[PDB]
Structure formats: structure tokens, C-alpha cells
Design a protein around this ligand. Structure first.
Ligand SMILES: Cc1cc2nc3c(=O)[nH]c(=O)nc-3n(C[C@H](O)[C@H](O)[C@H](O)COP(=O)(O)OP(=O)(O)OC[C@H]3O[C@@H](n4cnc5c(N)ncnc54)[C@H](O)[C@@H]3O)c2cc1C
Ligand SMILES: NC(=O)C1=CN([C@@H]2O[C@H](COP(=O)(O)OP(=O)(O)OC[C@H]3O[C@@H](n4cnc5c(N)ncnc54)[C@H](OP(=O)(O)O)[C@@H]3O)[C@@H](O)[C@H]2O)C=CC1
Ligand SMILES: NC(=O)C1=CN([C@@H]2O[C@H](COP(=O)(O)OP(=O)(O)OC[C@H]3O[C@@H](n4cnc5c(N)ncnc54)[C@H](OP(=O)(O)O)[C@@H]3O)[C@@H](O)[C@H]2O)C=CC1
Ligand code: SF4
Ligand code: SF4
Ligand code: SF4
Ligand code: SF4
Ligand code: SF4
Ligand code: SF4
Ligand code: FES
Ligand code: FES
Lengths: 1172, 117, 118
């Protein structure tokens, strides 16, 4: 004891002996890199990233393999450790092939996750797609409408056909969620700081949006009547609607940002005023000057700049154009001026440019649309002089150029030859370019081109407390460049306001440049969704929109075409985390070799990529030591070491369980699990903790979802052991099934017709009343499924009581295990937590195949486990076992005073002979001090369970800690179903149906009619209600079907097979409208029983169910067991009437006949296994 | 009966009326739970709208035997979703609207043959 | 390491080596009487109120002086422990002089704390 205390990295910490230094440092928030360390298995020592320096040791020690001692001094951030980790990471990055991020995202200036929201649209989740888009910009509809999309240039779908329409999808999502429920991001608590933003263009609005989300108070000073910047006063109305821009700015100003219009800084309000009154200042003034013609007579009346012209068009001012207008320039300003002039009644518009069409910096789409609308292009012509009389410009004398040598930028330089041409024009508009003007703002340094000089990456001007960004710094660019600069400056300002200014730096990713068209030649080809463009006859006269937003069918069709280029493991990969932490270059030299694979492993569940393997060996170690399948292994030496299945066979031809533990321990993207959703994606999923709904083992899970789609399930390594199996890892895809029912249906004239919930409730209540009135008591059977929660089962029992019946049963429970007649409670006498302290485990049945996580736990515990032999499939062999145990000298007096009928049990074993193997098993069992018997309920009959109870009772190994019988139930809530009274055998139900006693049946979650005997039985009923998720075989035979929700949409509790009550939480909202508890509550309220919430039902459970005392305030986040919160049963005597174990004779029971699956979810999983 | 008047309509109308400021106290029988003198003392006026809630008997020999029940009581137990017993054959005595409602509700409640006397 | 786990009073608990059974039970909300135990000094063994029954031991052990081991079964509410604690408390109450509550409060029918508010 004495408080073992270590000193690491300067701090003094109190730890526990036996722990490694890695665990001890991580418990106290000290981060040490590791790749090959798992705390549940032995150390390996492959990566070497966990090296620390320990005083008294000449060489670096691996903190994953050294246990803590008392008073040892550890340093983790020295020069030697950092050098070793950087060298190791460089060597690892020397061998890695993959795309951390897709080409589309890396081509975007703002690094928007294009793959993420494209793949979220492909899943039908649009609010999530908008939430993903809004992490980078505040105005996605305008940007999606007007972006020149560099992302679509880099799209890899271009190697198959034309690429994905990323901007159109973004505009669709943004407008759909503007016209519906508007999304407001969460905001940090107020910090008490003040930031003044000058200008309300894209940069200023983005900086204000991202500083308000940090908790600061932002005020925007705009010189114009309305916000938007050049998006409002330079973008024409037919390309960008101003209603969209106004609606977005209103959404932003709802968040608490104040915008003050008609306030020009330096002309109306000084910058010193803002410097004194605010904690920071950001300058997003933009470039709001127009370049002149730079020719003779450029100052004459009749010549006006393009920016000024567009501004007067926007403000609905009085302009003069004339019949003929000459636009000088070739960029987007010239295109906008020319097309606005065509709409403003100019009869002929001509564009004067000094180069060719292919040399123009304008977009080809804009040029094509302009040519369609009617503007003529005059090429390779440079203006020289403006001619006019009486001060009114009337002609443009220009020089004729010729193509010359390319410049440094890759464009040919025009050269005059000898020729001039004079063009007649009423108006001459110079759309030559833009220049930044600082105006009257003083003490701000500017470049020779007018741009504000800032410190690169810190966005700081010469004046303190003042920052700059946008077109004021970079000059004229596209809008997403301004948005990116605004967001980066917002981050830098936010860091500065906390007292430590850090500059913005780009991140390092692994990228692939070897992808060619031949590598994608197996992809099918699907044509792009073309844009609906209005005819050019009506476009030339109106300022109406020239294109339409995508519909939902078009958006789904376009989004389902993505190739999913980026790594799915990016948000959880540990290689890229350390690569970016230690700043290792991911660039590759061509003179070194990385192994490239042509792998073909089309396993339906597990994907293996040897190109992304760091050879930590965690997968083979887990599959060997934990699972025990040993389906994969190492092959080779040195560089040629590769992990692959047995004999290089496919993973489907080997002993794989498809558990997915190799996926769960992998630190990189070498092992991934397959997609549960319609199209999986790399995303930060939301996680909800629940329990598995397939086995009685009750493994804890984390459901990872995004909106209303469940994407994956991971083990819960914090609250449990962190293991799963195939049904728990991959079994929650039925939540995403499109074949699930949505509304109740009633059979009229032999057709199912949809009804409302009230009509369905009235119909089922009245029909049950009709059956009771015609046929009296006990004419209704209630058959439930043991997959429902405890509250659902309690309400089903109440419903059975309300319609005057005692036949409550289940096809899966089928009467219990028979342990209740012997001991008193039909439950296991010990918990799973006591499996580690036994010195002998006797396994009866196929525990490994049915409940494999239990076998994982038993194997990792390391105790001696002996399986019951398969050649002893007769009960007479068990009687020989009892005789051999009795001949080994048990205490007859204690078992005589504690049991009933031990004398007859001794008499019936009088002439029983004992074989050699039976003697060996009995000696092994009776020798051990604390043995456990683990009985698998699926493959073991009731008499074998009774005989194991007899052995444990007569030996004396029951009713104590680490000694007794563990019984593993078939379904998740079989224990809860047994506790609520669903213990009637189904032979009684079949006999009552065929004898005319039972006329109606209520089936909840089961499918008995998949087999012909029960189907012909159900054909003789009078009425049948089926509560199920799918329209299965039984629901087709019903007179009424009511839908049920999946386990990812329910709140409740499940009782484990070791009597532990666990909380089940709802990941996603119910897709049918109502949950099962609500349906049962409404029906019971119709029948006359009043419950309101689940708390009332839990109080009723605690008051009525005998052994569940304490469920009202149990706090199921901790461990709750129902008998007095006790792990061990019968510590004070058995639960029978006389407090004695009832030992009675058992007949000769032949070899077991395998049981059937009646739950619809189980058979859905089984049938879907064959589909892949 | 429910097939002629939906109770959802009646509940919605009464909710509309109780939005106006009228308090309705259920499960309170005047004279059995609360005296009429109490209401006389505590209120400025009292209105009695108790209705006619008894059923006439058969006025015949053996009318008190088990297996004979009144129409109003039968309809009330049908409405409250209580446990009733009908049998295959049911004889309804009467010719008014009570007899029609009883006979048609009996046809819906699984009676194989209903005859009106 | 290996998760030292004991089983006391029917429950299974995970504890740390070197701790006494008294500390281990009190960490998990199990109340065992004690009068002469201080966790910062050595055990004494005077009162004897901390006696529990441990499997494998013929006589009651003092939980203030026995450290936890792996997989030991402890009961604190048996007949023997309750009898021993009641006898010890009777012998202690055989020698105690004092007023737990003043005469003024014990004479009040509602047992109002007269000394307290006075
Ligand atoms: C004609 C034209 C067409 C364009 N078309 C496209 C296109 O199709 N696609 C695309 O992606 N990009 C396009 N752009 C580019 C895009 O509009 C800009 O690059 C982007 O809006 C830059 O915005 P900003 O925040 O840097 O500054 P701006 O939005 O230009 O201006 C910010 C604000 O600062 C205010 N301001 C200026 N001086 C002061 C002062 N002294 N005090 C207070 N406030 C002040 C102004 O009123 C303005 O509202 C176009 C640009 C122009 C000119
Ligand atoms: N922010 C934006 O939206 C972008 C701007 N534009 C265009 O560029 C302008 C401003 O940006 P930027 O490209 O830096 O501006 P520039 O100064 O490069 O001018 C751009 C256009 O004008 C031509 N030009 C420039 N000076 C003269 C002169 N004395 N005589 C004749 N032609 C000239 C250029 O052709 P050349 O090809 O020979 O250089 C090009 O057509 C905008 O007004 C617009 O017309 C276009 C795309 C993006
Ligand atoms: N409020 C309502 O909705 C109205 C009531 N009803 C019927 O009338 C009943 C109560 O109203 P009211 O008309 O004043 O009641 P009555 O006392 O007049 O009885 C009405 C019905 O019962 C018959 N009847 C009465 N006494 C006997 C008896 N000893 N033997 C056989 N048949 C008998 C009547 O037929 P006869 O024609 O020979 O009088 C008639 O069918 C209701 O139960 C209902 O059956 C019908 C219409 C309106
Ligand atoms: S903002 Fe522009 S570059 Fe970025 S994803 Fe959208 S269309 Fe592509
Ligand atoms: S195919 Fe999909 S993931 Fe690949 S670049 Fe195009 S949009 Fe991005
Ligand atoms: S496994 Fe990790 S490092 Fe490798 S490409 Fe994927 S995210 Fe990047
Ligand atoms: S596949 Fe994954 S777990 Fe296995 S060695 Fe490679 S990186 Fe490690
Ligand atoms: S899924 Fe399980 S059994 Fe299959 S290779 Fe991975 S760890 Fe081994
Ligand atoms: S062992 Fe049973 S409870 Fe655990 S994950 Fe597998 S099916 Fe689910
Ligand atoms: S060498 Fe210790 S974590 Fe890899
Ligand atoms: S506390 Fe007194 S003997 Fe242990």
C-alpha cells in the first residue's frame, strides 16, 4: 500500500502497482504515443513509439511493457524520445499508400468535406449534410449557386465520365433547409470580449459567424444599405437571387450579430474609435475600385467603370446606356456587364478583348451562355484612343494584335502589328479589373497594388489589435477564397483573444497520384444530372433565374454516383494523428519502393488493405489469444512480412467468425468493417451507449449514427470487456431496412388498408372484447417475444390481465429451463463477474457457437475448462455421473436436511455402474474447490439442467460465491420474460387452439407461422393481431398488423442472464411515430389502466413484480441485480415453499432435437447472411 | 354506439368548451359523494341535468333471474371496454332506439343470431 | 494486478491490494462498526466491533487488521457477528455516565431541542 507514487514529466502522481507506465500516465492525462499496445493482452514491442526515459536506465524503456514502481522518475518529452518517435514515424510513412482526404476536398480552398455531405445526401440525410456544410461557411446556398467549383475539376469521377455535381448538391441542401427548419449551431458561453468587423462581404460575414460561435460579441460595420458585398452589388440578380442572401443574413443575425449599415470607417467613424472601444478589429473591406482604360481620352464623358455600372444597376438607380455599348475586358466582370446590358435594352453589345476565346479568364459556361443570349465577341483587339465630339465619347479606336510568346503564367502575349479599327459605340464600359482602395483609413500600410500588407498566416497589419483578410489582402479572387481567409482569420483572432497568438498552418495528408483511368475501368458509367436552363428567348429580357435548383430525385441520383475516394478510417486513424503531431512529411521519393497490392478479398464484412498496414500485429494477437479462431497469420520476413488468412485462402474459406475484433483493435485503415448504411462515408458519428439485443450475454455497445441512419456498432471498452460477436457488431442493419412497416393495416375484403393509430387502437380493443363476450374466460392467448424490454413485457402482462386471460407465453421461452422447480428461481445462481475466480468450469452445450463472447471471457480468464463430451448425449450417462459423485464421499446428512427426496434419489442409483471417463469427470469436478457449470440453454434439454442442479446440490457447490450454476439464456430479455410470468408452455397453446378453447391470439414480435404446423394451427383461429417490424409470414395471415420499432429506437431495460438489469437507450427517433411502450400505454388507457410515462411503469414494476424491488430508483447506469442487488443466489436458503431443494426422478431423455428460431429479427439476420 | 358517433369528436368539442373557462369535475356523484346542501351553500345557483339513467324491467315472471340485463347497463359496459358475456343467441325486447342500438352492438360483438321481440 | 476482487455480503467488489476489509467495504457503501480504527496509524484491536466471518477461518476475524486477498468470501451480518457486537455494546453501556439529551428536551412531548435554540 503506502501510496505508490511516481514522478513523471515533472508531476507527482499516485498510482497502483501492476499497472504499466502507459496506463498510469493516461489515467492522469499525460499522452504517450502507442500503436501496438492493447491493455487486455500481452505486450508486443513492435512500434517503439512508447519509449520514455527513466532515471537509472541507460537506454530508453518501453512504457507499454514496464510496470510502475515506487519513486521512479520518468520523462516522456526529451530530445531522445522525440527523435526516436519522429524517425519511427518517418519510416512508417515511407511505406503507406492511401488518401487521407479525397481530391475534391483538397481542391476546395475552404477544405469543405465534399465526400461527407455528398455521401450524406446519398443516404437521404439532408439536415446532417447542412450541418456538415455549415462547419465552414455561413452562406452555403449563395456559394453553391455561384462557385466556379475547383473541387469538380479534381474529382476522380472525371476518369470514368463527367464528375459529380458538388456545387448543385450543396445549393440543394442549403435551400431545402432554409425553406424548412432553420439550423443554428451551438455557441460557446459569452467571454466578455468585443470584436469589430469592417465590411459585410463573404470574408466579414464568415469572420463574424465564426467569432460569434466562439462566444464573442461581434459588431459589423458596413458602408452599404444592405449586406452581402460583391455578392449583392457585383453578382447579377439572374445568377444570384438577393432573397436567398437576405434570408441567410437574417439567419446569421438571429444568432446575436449586430450589423450597422451606412457606416463607412475612416469617412464616418474613425478607426481609432474602433481600436479604443473593441478588443479586436478585422478589416474585410474588399477591392472596390475599377481600373481605367489606360488610354487617351479615358476621362471623357460617356466612359464608366464596370463596378460602378453594376452597382447602379443593383440599386435601381437611373442609368443611361444607349443602343450600342462596348465592353472592354475579358473576365467575369466583362461577362456580367455584357449580359446585364443585353437585359437592359441595349440592342447590340460587343466585347473588346486583346486575346482569344480559349485564352479568356472567364468560365466557358458563362461565355457559352453569353453567346447564346446575343452578345458578340471581338477578339485580339486592344483599345488605343476614345474618340468623341463635344465631350461625349462616340467611338473607340483600337489596335489589332497578334498571338505571341507565352508569359510566365502560360498565356500568350499579344503584339500589335500595323492595323487600327474604329468601333462605333454610344457607351463604353471599362470592365478591365479591380483594385483595392484603403480610402481614408489611416496608419495602415499598403502594397504597390493597393493590397493591405499583413504578416503571413497571422493576418496582422502594422497597427496592433487590427487584422485583415479577404480581397483586401489577396486581391480579386473567387468568393470561397474570401470565405476561407475569413474563417482562418477568425481562428487566429480567437487564439489571440485568449492570450497566445498562433499562426495558421496547413495540415499534412497522404495522397495518391498513381490513379489512372485504367484503374477505374471496372466502374459502371452513369450520366450526369444536367441542369435545367431557361430558353434564351426569354432570358434576354428578364432578370429571372437562368437555372433551377436540383429536385430530390435528381439530388439522390447525382449523389449516389460518388466513388468514395477518401479513407473511411480518417477520423479514428492513429497513424495520421501522430504524423501530424510530430510534423512528419508525407511526401514520397520515387527512388524508394513501397509495396503495392492487387488484393482481391471480397469478404462481405471485413475489408483488409495491406497497403495501410503498420504491422503492429494486434489483429493476429487478438484472433489467436482472444477469439481463438486463428483465421489470420503472418507470412514472410522483413519487408515481405504480410498478414493474410490461412494458406493464403480467402477469408470466407477459413475459420473466421466475422466477429470484427481485428477491425476493432486496428489503429489504421488496414482493417475496416463493411458498411451498414446505404453508402458509408468517413464522418464523425454520434455515439449512444446501449446493449446488444440478440444474446443473453448482454454485451454493451456504442451505436454510431448520423441523423436517422445507423452506421456502425462498436464495443464498449470502458464499462465492459469490450468484446462483441457478429450479431452484435453487424446485426443492427435492420434499423436501416426499407421494408419496415410504417402504419397499422387492417384487413378488409381480403386487402390490408392503412389506418390511423386511433382507428387501429379501437379495432384491436373492440375485437378482443368481442372474443371475450362470445367465448368467455381464457379464450385469448398472449404470445410475446423475449426481445422486448421489461416495461413492454410488464404492460403486455397487464393487457393479458385486462382481457381476462391467463395464457401468457412465448415460443422462445417455452416453459423455462426447469431450474425453478428444483431451486425456486429460474435463474443462474452466480454472475459472469465470478467466472475469473473459479478453478474449474464445466461447459454443457455449445457455448462457443451460440454465445461466443462468453467463450472469449472464459479463454482470457485462464481457468481450467472441461467440456461435457458429445458421446454422452443420454441422461443415463448423467445418472452415472451422479452415482460417481455420490461414491466419492459427499455429506449425506447436510443434503438430507436441506433437500426433499434425497433418499429416493439414492435408491434409484443403487445398481448404476460407473465407467472410466465418467469417473475422471466426476473426480475433476469433486476435487476442485470452487467449480462453475455453464449451461447453454439453446442446445441442452430441461432434464440435463435438472441433473446438473442435482449434482451441484448434493455435492454442496451451490449457494456460495464462485460456486454454482451459470445459465445462459437464448434471447436478451429471456430472464425478464420469465420474471413477468411468460412461462406457460406453447404445447398448451397448441392444444387449446385445436380443442376450440382458444379463439384469439395476440402475437408480439414473433413469427410462428414460418413452419407449416403452426401455420395450419393459426389458420383455425378467429382473430389474430401481429405486432412486428416486417410484413413476415405470420403478419400476412393476421387480421391486423401494428408496427414495432427496432432496438436502436427504444428506451428501457434488459435483464441479463445473470440477473443484471441494464439500461437501453434510443439512438434515433422512432420512424413509425410511436414506440412500443406508447402503443401499449394507449391500448391500456383505452382498457381502463392509467400510465403516463416510463417512470410510472417503473414504479408499478417495483410495486408489483416481487423480486424487482428497487427499480424505481435503481440508477441503471451502475450495476443492478434484482435479488437485493446480490451477485449470489440462495445465500440464506432456497426459494422453494419449504426452503428445501426438491429432488425428483427424471426419465430417460433421448438425444436432443435442435430448437427453432421464432423471433423475426433472428431469422431476418439468418436470411440476410445468405444474401451476401 | 361508437359506429354512429365518434367519441373523438365529442372529446374535442368538450375540450374546446373547457378552454373557455368551464371547470368539469369528474367522478363526483351529487348526493352520494357531495351533498346538494354543500352546493346550495357554496354557489349562487344550481342546475340539475341528471338525465334518465334507469332501465325499465321486463315486468314479467322471472325477470330477476340471472342472465337478464338491462339495455342501458349493457351499452354502458360496452362503452367502458369492460368484460361482458353474451353467448351465441341474444333476444332483445323492445322497439325503440335503445333496442336498435343494443341489437346492432350485439351483432358487432360476436352474437351469431340476434332477434328483436 | 489481474483485478483483485473480493466477495463480501453477497456482492462482488473490485478492490486494491494492501487495503483492509474495513476500508474496502466502506469504499463500496457497506457499513461495518468500528471504534478503535484509524486508517493512518497501526491497528489496535480493542473494541472488537469490526468482526466479520471469512470462509476458511474457524473464528471471527477483525476486518480492521486483515488485508484483502483475491477471492475471499466475507459476511458481516451473520448471527455470530451481531451477537458479538451486541454483547460488546452492552458491556460498554454498562460503564457510561452521561446525558445524551438534556432533561428539558426529554420532557417535551415533541422532543424539541430546547438546549439548542436556547
Ligand atoms: C462583378 C463581379 C463578379 C463576381 N462573380 C463571382 C462569381 O461568379 N463567383 C465567385 O466565386 N466570385 C465572384 N466574384 C468575386 C467575389 O464577389 C469576391 O471575391 C468576394 O465577394 C470578396 O469579398 P470580400 O469580403 O473580400 O469583400 P467584398 O464583399 O467585395 O466587400 C466587403 C464589404 O466591405 C465594405 N466596405 C468597403 N470599404 C469599407 C469601408 N471603408 N468601411 C466600411 N465598409 C467598407 C463594402 O461595402 C462591402 O460590402 C465576383 C466579383 C465581382 C466584382
Ligand atoms: N474575382 C473574380 O471574380 C475574378 C476576376 N476576373 C476578371 O479579372 C478582373 C480583376 O481581377 P484580375 O484578373 O486580377 O484583373 P486583371 O488586372 O488581370 O484584369 C483582368 C482582365 O482584363 C484584361 N486587362 C487587364 N489590364 C488591361 C489593359 N490595359 N488593357 C486591356 N485589357 C486588360 C485581362 O486579360 P488577360 O487575360 O490578357 O490578362 C483580363 O481580361 C475582374 O474585373 C474580371 O474582369 C475573372 C475571374 C476571377
Ligand atoms: N330518447 C330517445 O332516444 C327515444 C326513446 N326511444 C325508445 O323509448 C325508450 C324510452 O322512451 P319511451 O318511449 O318514453 O319509453 P316507453 O316506456 O314508451 O317504451 C318504449 C318502447 O318499449 C315498448 N314497451 C314499453 N313497455 C313495455 C312492456 N311491459 N312490454 C313490452 N314493450 C314495452 C314500446 O312500444 P310501443 O310502441 O307499443 O309503445 C316501445 O318499443 C327507449 O328505451 C327506446 O327503446 C325511442 C325513440 C326516442
Ligand atoms: S465551395 Fe466551391 S470549391 Fe468548395 S466544395 Fe463548394 S463548389 Fe467546391
Ligand atoms: S468521386 Fe466522390 S470522393 Fe472522389 S473526388 Fe469525386 S466527389 Fe470526391
Ligand atoms: S489509414 Fe490513416 S494514415 Fe493511412 S490513408 Fe487512412 S487515414 Fe491516412
Ligand atoms: S492489419 Fe491493422 S491490426 Fe493488423 S497488423 Fe496491420 S495495422 Fe495492425
Ligand atoms: S473477424 Fe474475428 S475470427 Fe475473423 S479474422 Fe477477424 S478476429 Fe479473426
Ligand atoms: S455474444 Fe450475444 S449479446 Fe454478445 S454481441 Fe454476440 S449476440 Fe450480442
Ligand atoms: S512498443 Fe510499446 S506501444 Fe508499441
Ligand atoms: S475496529 Fe476495533 S477491533 Fe477493529
Amino acid at each position: 500500500m503506502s501510496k505508490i507514487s511516481i514522478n513523471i514529466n515533472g508531476r507527482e502522481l499516485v498510482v497502483s502497482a501492476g499497472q504499466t507506465i502507459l496506463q498510469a500516465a493516461a489515467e492522469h492525462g499525460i499522452e504517450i504515443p502507442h500503436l501496438c499496445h492493447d491493455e487486455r493482452i500481452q505486450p508486443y514491442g513492435a512500434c517503439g513509439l512508447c519509449v520514455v526515459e527513466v532515471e537509472g536506465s541507460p537506454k530508453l524503456v518501453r512504457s507499454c511493457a514496464t510496470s510502475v514502481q515506487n519513486g521512479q522518475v520518468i520523462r516522456t518529452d526529451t530530445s531522445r524520445t522525440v527523435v526516436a518517435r519522429k524517425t519511427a514515424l518517418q519510416l512508417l510513412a515511407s511505406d503507406h499508400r492511401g488518401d487521407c482526404r479525397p481530391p475534391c476536398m483538397l481542391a476546395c480552398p475552404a477544405q469543405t468535406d465534399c465526400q461527407g455531405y455528398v455521401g450524406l445526401i446519398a443516404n437521404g440525410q439532408y439536415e446532417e449534410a447542412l450541418k456538415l456544410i455549415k462547419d465552414k461557411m455561413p452562406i452555403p446556398a449563395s456559394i453553391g449557386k455561384i462557385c466556379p467549383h475547383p473541387c469538380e475539376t479534381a474529382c476522380r469521377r472525371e476518369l470514368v465520365e463527367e464528375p459529380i455535381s458538388i456545387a448543385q448538391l450543396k445549393s440543394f441542401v442549403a435551400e431545402v433547409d432554409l425553406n424548412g427548419n432553420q439550423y443554428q449551431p451551438p455557441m460557446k458561453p459569452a467571454t466578455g470580449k468585443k470584436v469589430a468587423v469592417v465590411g459585410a462581404g463573404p470574408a466579414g460575414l464568415t469572420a463574424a459567424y465564426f467569432l460569434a460561435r466562439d462566444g464573442h460579441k461581434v459588431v459589423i460595420y458596413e458602408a452599404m444599405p444592405h449586406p452581402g458585398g460583391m455578392l449583392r452589388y457585383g453578382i447579377p440578380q439572374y445568377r444570384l437571387d438577393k432573397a436567398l442572401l437576405d434570408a441567410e443574413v437574417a439567419l446569421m443575425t438571429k444568432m446575436g450579430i449586430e450589423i450597422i449599415y451606412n457606416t463607412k470607417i475612416g469617412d464616418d467613424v474613425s478607426l481609432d474609435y474602433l481600436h479604443d472601444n473593441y478588443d479586436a478589429v478585422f478589416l474585410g473591406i474588399g477591392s472596390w475600385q475599377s481600373q481605367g482604360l489606360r488610354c487617351k481620352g479615358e476621362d471623357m464623358e460617356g466612359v464608366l467603370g464596370g463596378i460602378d455600372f453594376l452597382r447602379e444597376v443593383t440599386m435601381n438607380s437611373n442609368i443611361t446606356l444607349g443602343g450600342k455599348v462596348l465592353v472592354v475586358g475579358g473576365g467575369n466582370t466583362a461577362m456580367d456587364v455584357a449580359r446585364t446590358s443585353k437585359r437592359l435594352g441595349a440592342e447590340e453589345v460587343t466585347i473588346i478583348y486583346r486575346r482569344t476565346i480559349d485564352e479568356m479568364p472567364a468560365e466557358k459556361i458563362e461565355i457559352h451562355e453569353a453567346q447564346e443570349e446575343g452578345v458578340k465577341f471581338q477578339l485580339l483587339v486592344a483599345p488605343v484612343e476614345v474618340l468623341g465630339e463635344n465631350g461625349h465619347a462616340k467611338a473607340l479606336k483600337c489596335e489589332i494584335m497578334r498571338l505571341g510568346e507565352p508569359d510566365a503564367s502560360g498565356r500568350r502575349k499579344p503584339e500589335p502589328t500595323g492595323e487600327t479599327v474604329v468601333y462605333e459605340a454610344d457607351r463604353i464600359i471599362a470592365a478591365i479589373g479591380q483594385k483595392t482602395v484603403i480610402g481614408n483609413i489611416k496608419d495602415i500600410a499598403t502594397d504597390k497594388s493597393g493590397n493591405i500588407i499583413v504578416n503571413g498566416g497571422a493576418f496582422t497589419t502594422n497597427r496592433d489589435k487590427v487584422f485583415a483578410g479577404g480581397d483586401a489582402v489577396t486581391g480579386p479572387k473567387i468568393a470561397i477564397d474570401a470565405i476561407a481567409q475569413g474563417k482562418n482569420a477568425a481562428q487566429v483572432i480567437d487564439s489571440y483573444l485568449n492570450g497566445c497568438l498562433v499562426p495558421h498552418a496547413d495540415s499534412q495528408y497522404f495522397t495518391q497520384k498513381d490513379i489512372t483511368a485504367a484503374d477505374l475501368a471496372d466502374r459502371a458509367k452513369a450520366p450526369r444530372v444536367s441542369l435545367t436552363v431557361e430558353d434564351a428567348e426569354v432570358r434576354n429580357k428578364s432578370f429571372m433565374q437562368v437555372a433551377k435548383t436540383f429536385t430530390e430525385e435528381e439530388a439522390l441520383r447525382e449523389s449516389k454516383r460518388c466513388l468514395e475516394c477518401g479513407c473511411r478510417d480518417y477520423f479514428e486513424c492513429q497513424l495520421i494523428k501522430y504524423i501530424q503531431d510530430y510534423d512528419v512529411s508525407t511526401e514520397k521519393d520515387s527512388q524508394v519502393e513501397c509495396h503495392k497490392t492487387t488484393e482481391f478479398d471480397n469478404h462481405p464484412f471485413i475489408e483488409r488493405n495491406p497497403d495501410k498496414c503498420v504491422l503492429c500485429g494486434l489483429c493476429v494477437r487478438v484472433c489467436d489469444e482472444v477469439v481463438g479462431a486463428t483465421a489470420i497469420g503472418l507470412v514472410g520476413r522483413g519487408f515481405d512480412s504480410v498478414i493474410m488468412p490461412e494458406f493464403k485462402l480467402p477469408l470466407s474459406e477459413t475459420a473466421c467468425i466475422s466477429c470484427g475484433q481485428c477491425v476493432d483493435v486496428c489503429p489504421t485503415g488496414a482493417c475496416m468493417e463493411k458498411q451498414v448504411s446505404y453508402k458509408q462515408i468517413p464522418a464523425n458519428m454520434d455515439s449512444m451507449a446501449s446493449v446488444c439485443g440478440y444474446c443473453g450475454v448482454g454485451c454493451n455497445v456504442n451505436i454510431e449514427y448520423k441523423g436517422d441512419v445507423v452506421f456502425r456498432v462498436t464495443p464498449d471498452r470502458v464499462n465492459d470487456d469490450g468484446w462483441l460477436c457478429q450479431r452484435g457488431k453487424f446485426g443492427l442493419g435492420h434499423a436501416n431496412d426499407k421494408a419496415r412497416l410504417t402504419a397499422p393495416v387492417i384487413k378488409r375484403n381480403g386487402q390490408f388498408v392503412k389506418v390511423d393509430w386511433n382507428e387501429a387502437n379501437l379495432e384491436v380493443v373492440k375485437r378482443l372484447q368481442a372474443v371475450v363476450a362470445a367465448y368467455g374466460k381464457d379464450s385469448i392467448g398472449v404470445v410475446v417475444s423475449p426481445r422486448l424490454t421489461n416495461e413492454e413485457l410488464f404492460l403486455a402482462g397487464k393487457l393479458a390481465d385486462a382481457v381476462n386471460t391467463t395464457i401468457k407465453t412465448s415460443y422462445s421461452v417455452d416453459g423455462g429451463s426447469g431450474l425453478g422447480s428444483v431451486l425456486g428461481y429460474d435463474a443462474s445462481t452466480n454472475s459472469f463477474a465470478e467466472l475469473d475466480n473459479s478453478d474449474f468450469v464445466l461447459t454443457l452445450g455449445k457455448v462457443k457457437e451460440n454465445h461466443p463472447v462468453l467463450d472469449f471471457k472464459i479463454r482470457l480468464s485462464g481457468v481450467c475448462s472441461v467440456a461435457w463430451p458429445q458421446s454422452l448425449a443420454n441422461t443415463a450417462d448423467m445418472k452415472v455421473f451422479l452415482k460417481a459423485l455420490l461414491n466419492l464421499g459427499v455429506d449425506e446428512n447436510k443434503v438430507a436436511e436441506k433437500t426433499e427426496g434425497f433418499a429416493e434419489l439414492k435408491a434409484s442409483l443403487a445398481d448404476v455402474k460407473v465407467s472410466e471417463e465418467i469417473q475422471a469427470l466426476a473426480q475433476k469436478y469433486a476435487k476442485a474447490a470452487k467449480p462453475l457449470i455453464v449451461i447453454d440453454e439453446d442446445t441442452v434439454s430441461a432434464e440435463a439442467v435438472k441433473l446438473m442442479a442435482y449434482a451441484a446440490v448434493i455435492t454442496g457447490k451451490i449457494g456460495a460465491a464462485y460456486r454454482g450454476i451459470i445459465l445462459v439464456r437464448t434471447k436478451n430479455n429471456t430472464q425478464g420474460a420469465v420474471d413477468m410470468g411468460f412461462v406457460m408452455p406453447v404445447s398448451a397453446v397448441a392444444q387449446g387452439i385445436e380443442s376450440g378453447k382458444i379463439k384469439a391470439l395476440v402475437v408480439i414480435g414473433e413469427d410462428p407461422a414460418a413452419y407449416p404446423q403452426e401455420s395450419a394451427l393459426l389458420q383455425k383461429l378467429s382473430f389474430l393481431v401481429v405486432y412486428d417490424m416486417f410484413m413476415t409470414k405470420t403478419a400476412t395471415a393476421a387480421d391486423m398488423v401494428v408496427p414495432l420499432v427496432s432496438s436502436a429506437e427504444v428506451n428501457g431495460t434488459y435483464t441479463r442472464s445473470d440477473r443484471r438489469i441494464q439500461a437501453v437507450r434510443a439512438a434515433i427517433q422512432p420512424k413509425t411515430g410511436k414506440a412500443t411502450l406508447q402503443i401499449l400505454i394507449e391500448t391500456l388507457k383505452s382498457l381502463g389502466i392509467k400510465y403516463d410515462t416510463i417512470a410510472d411503469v417503473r414504479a408499478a414494476i417495483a410495486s408489483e413484480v416481487s423480486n424487482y424491488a428497487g427499480m424505481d430508483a435503481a440508477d441503471f447506469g451502475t450495476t443492478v441485480y434484482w435479488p437485493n442487488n446480490k451477485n449470489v443466489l440462495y445465500t440464506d436458503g432456497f426459494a422453494t415453499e419449504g426452503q428445501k431443494a426438491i429432488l425428483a426422478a427424471v426419465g430417460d431423455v433421448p438425444v436432443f432435437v435442435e430448437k427453432k428460431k421464432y423471433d423475426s429479427v433472428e431469422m431476418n439476420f439468418v436470411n440476410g447472411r445468405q444474401s451476401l
